[PDB]
Design a binder for this molecule. Structure first.
Ligand SMILES: NC(=O)c1ccc[n+]([C@@H]2O[C@H](COP(=O)([O-])OP(=O)(O)OC[C@H]3O[C@@H](n4cnc5c(N)ncnc54)[C@H](OP(=O)(O)O)[C@@H]3O)[C@@H](O)[C@H]2O)c1
Ligand SMILES: Nc1nc(=O)c2nc(CNc3ccc(C(=O)N[C@@H](CCC(=O)O)C(=O)O)cc3)cnc2[nH]1
Ligand SMILES: [Mn+2]
Ligand SMILES: [Mn+2]
Length: 159
């Protein structure tokens, strides 16, 4: 199955100028625990934002052009990306906006972080029809000495 995982600010903002302009250690820890030991699929801009491979995960980068780093696996279409993951239980799509929009129709779960932050952005999570998803997990946290905003982890499953 295919899952998307994302962090959303107000208005579905997910990025600005190829970065995420918040800093939430709790949410990066949640990202790691939900992705480790799985394939991750990302677009080339997100690969450039992360700036290095992610350890302990098969890294599969979508680009139309040939790859430039053999520490990761480069593919040129959605179907090739899926094929390159092999027979695993859960593929994790880790963005960015253009890649999320393509994989939404093929996905069974969304792991969302809802962050209580108002920021300007240039990238959004795709609009998703709410009726088609059920919430199966919703865990709220107030801001603390490490995490400057409140946030909510949510898992949704396609009904
Ligand atoms: N908040 C979050 O959870 C989160 C998560 C991920 C990313 N982000 C943010 O999202 C932004 C990046 O997103 P983005 O929408 O600009 O870009 P993106 O989706 O990461 O990358 C798009 C690129 O991927 C390639 N691509 C996409 N679909 C393809 C396909 N079907 N076949 C072949 N290649 C394909 C293309 O590369 P080529 O141009 O090389 O052909 C395309 O330009 C950044 O601001 C980043 O910080 C936020
Ligand atoms: N929930 C969620 N939060 C995010 O921040 C996020 N970011 C991306 C894309 N960007 C990034 C940027 C950095 C790292 C990162 O450094 N993660 C490391 C270390 C985590 C840490 O230092 O705590 C990792 O091992 O996963 C991952 C993805 C995709 N999905 C997400 N999903
Ligand atoms: Mn805030
Ligand atoms: Mn909900």
């Amino acid at each position: 199955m295919i899952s998307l995982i994302a962090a959303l600010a107000v208005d579905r903002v997910i990025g600005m100028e190829n970065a995420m302009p918040w800093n939430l250690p709790a949410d990066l820890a949640w990202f790691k625990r939900n992705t480790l030991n799985k394939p991750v699929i990302m677009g080339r801009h997100t690969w450039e934002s992360i700036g290095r491979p992610l350890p302990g995960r098969k890294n599969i980068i979508l680009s139309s052009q040939p790859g430039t780093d053999d520490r990761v696996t480069w593919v040129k279409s959605v179907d090739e990306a899926i094929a390159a993951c092999g027979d695993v239980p859960e593929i994790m799509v880790i963005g960015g906006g253009r890649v999320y929009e393509q994989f939404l129709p093929k996905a069974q779960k969304l792991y969302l972080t809802h962050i209580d932050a108002e920021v300007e952005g240039d990238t959004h999570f795709p609009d998703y029809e709410p009726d088609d998803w059920e919430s199966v997990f919703s865990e709220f946290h107030d801001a603390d000495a490490q995490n400057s905003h409140s946030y909510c982890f949510e898992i949704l499953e396609r009904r």
